[PDB]
Ligand binder design. Sequence first.
Ligand SMILES: CS(=O)(=O)c1cc(C(F)(F)F)ccc1[C@H](O)[C@@H](C=N)[C@H](O)C1CC1
Ligand SMILES: CS(=O)(=O)c1cc(C(F)(F)F)ccc1[C@H](O)[C@@H](C=N)[C@H](O)C1CC1
Ligand SMILES: [Co+2]
Ligand SMILES: [Co+2]
Lengths: 377, 377
Amino acid sequence: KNPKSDKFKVKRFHHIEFWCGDATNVARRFSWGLGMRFSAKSDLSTGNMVHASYLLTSGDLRFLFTAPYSPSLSAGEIKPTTTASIPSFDHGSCRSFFSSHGLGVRAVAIEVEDAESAFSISVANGAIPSSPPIVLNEAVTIAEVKLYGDVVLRYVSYKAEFLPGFERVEDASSFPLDYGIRRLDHAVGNVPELGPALTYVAGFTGFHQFSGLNSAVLASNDEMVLLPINEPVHGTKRKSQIQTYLEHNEGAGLQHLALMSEDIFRTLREMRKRSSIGGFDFMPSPPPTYYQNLKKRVGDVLSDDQIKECEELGILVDRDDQGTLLQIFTKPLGDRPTIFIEIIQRVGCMMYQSGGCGGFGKGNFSELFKSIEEYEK
Amino acid sequence: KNPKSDKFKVKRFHHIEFWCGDATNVARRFSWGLGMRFSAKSDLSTGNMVHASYLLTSGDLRFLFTAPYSPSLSAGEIKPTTTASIPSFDHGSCRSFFSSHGLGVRAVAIEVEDAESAFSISVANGAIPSSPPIVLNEAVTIAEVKLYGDVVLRYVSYKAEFLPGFERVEDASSFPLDYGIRRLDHAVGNVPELGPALTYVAGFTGFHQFSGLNSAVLASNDEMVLLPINEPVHGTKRKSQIQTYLEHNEGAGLQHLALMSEDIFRTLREMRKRSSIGGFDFMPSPPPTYYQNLKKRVGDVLSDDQIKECEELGILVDRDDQGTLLQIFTKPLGDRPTIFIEIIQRVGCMMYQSGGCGGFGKGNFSELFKSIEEYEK
Ligand SMILES: CS(=O)(=O)c1cc(C(F)(F)F)ccc1[C@H](O)[C@@H](C=N)[C@H](O)C1CC1
Ligand SMILES: CS(=O)(=O)c1cc(C(F)(F)F)ccc1[C@H](O)[C@@H](C=N)[C@H](O)C1CC1
Ligand SMILES: [Co+2]
Ligand SMILES: [Co+2]
């Protein structure tokens, strides 16, 4: 059941913004680890005396990395005279965010028809305003409301180059890396209480509902913008990783970004080659009993060779009644056991491919436990 | 003239510690960019609830990257019960350092005979104490005095594995990168006033004295520990880069680390291959007139082919009356135009090679200006 109850026209995920202590080093690490090209900048060389912002792209995926300069560089500015390209930026907020949470996602940005209308409608329906609509160069409008913790939902709308004041990067500095990642599939938050978080976000967006945790997924009308939320389950045998997240993050925040690949085999080969030379690490692989059990449930979708390829790369597989799901999880992206990345590829639900085809892998909780006990015995 | 006036026995440079917002991302970036192996860690997986510290090594060069966790993880600890492996660490100091200066060097660490004696003698001779001597596992002693700005000179002495509480890294995570860098040659600070800075540091160490700036070099008895200091020269045609440093850094701090390579050709080929894929960028190369002029002054040291190799890699060459110097400078290591790296190789002054053989390249200021005007006309 899709009631299509979006209170304003939502298009697609637009970008994810990380708040950093040093944007350069995080952006360079992520570029190499994920195969994303440097495509835009806003920093001292572009006249921005407030923050350094570097944009990485892979297909439609846009990762933005932002860090504050010394406030002294901009102490003579006021908001009407700012050189910041992102007018919602605030030195104090950014330093407080980073000091509190470590490296993590500040903004989940979605493109909308009219960011001013989205902001106004959201706040009229209970959204806590974070930054009011601001029109950039009479061309782009940006607005921000609180999503959970210190994460904001950022609305961006274009009249007709990422944002005004950003410059396209000199191609000598722009190496065309590409490991196959193409778009953001879903962005997941961790909260202490799932119920109130769902009520709040679904309340102001009109988005509809799509061990150790309970979760639920909020979705836009065409189910292309997917915002799941997790809460911990207490009293479990193993401590809930959601609670560990909340402790190490100092509260609610973004837990994982799921990045769609057009060729998850290639993506994982390229990422795994780079794990120990500056890239990202992956979670421990499931025992081979897991891949022994793959034939019984996805053998009509993947060949034995394609299953063997999942086994050599550590890929997990799930399927609902509509499509099949390939996925894998990285180790945490930074010092704290908080944010990590999922790589995903979906097969089926062609009409283009509908949103959330195959689900989100919830069956892999029971399948992993099964395979673990099976390999043990 | 070397009076050999060290007030305590100094051995060699031991490590450089960067204070970071996220140690993981900076360490991974630096590892790939410089060809340094991950060799030790102290973090949550080793019981350290206070700070995350990752050690990179290349030959004798040791780069340490440290960031604070949430203080809540260690709120029940006191100093006698700390899980920090570096007992001088303080969350508030680290956050204040990073917020003030951005990514940069907190500690220049030198190995000494007796860190307690070095600390006591230093403070008796005017050093401002920063952290008193602490004996780690009855095996290593660490002490810290102020050097300049918020940079400390750290003394380390060993009775007889980097520091107690650090673990050697699982070799799967330890890829044996190596681009030829072998040791720290010199570590340079920027101050507003060279005179008072020199008097202070030479006062408590007994170290002896070895455009847009004035500089001077302080050296230990065998001139293996080299600590130059720069001050700006005001009223110049172009703004002094030392003053830009002081403005963007919020005061004095470490300006550049010069890393000796046993094969600077190889090092630069390997680093330049990685500049646009996560590594470090290099300053713009000198005009070819510079390399046309190399024959007249170093043609008895380098062949035409070896000179051509310097030209293709952008290497600068200088020479005093004792040895010859190959050098090159990176662009700033992070967001701010503050700290950068020099790669260096020295030829001559064999007895092993004496310290500072060939000087520090001060002749390349006039040679660069010459070559620029020559190529212009
Ligand atoms: C939460 S998870 O990152 O721990 C995780 C863990 C596994 C497992 F392989 F460990 F079983 C499998 C899938 C996931 C997924 O991400 C999904 C949760 N069911 C999804 O994102 C949605 C919340 C909607
Ligand atoms: C300061 S520097 O990093 O701007 C720099 C710049 C050039 C030039 F190629 F630009 F001319 C050449 C060499 C250097 C050096 O590092 C040395 C300073 N003379 C040294 O470290 C010592 C202070 C003792
Ligand atoms: Co997921
Ligand atoms: Co130098």
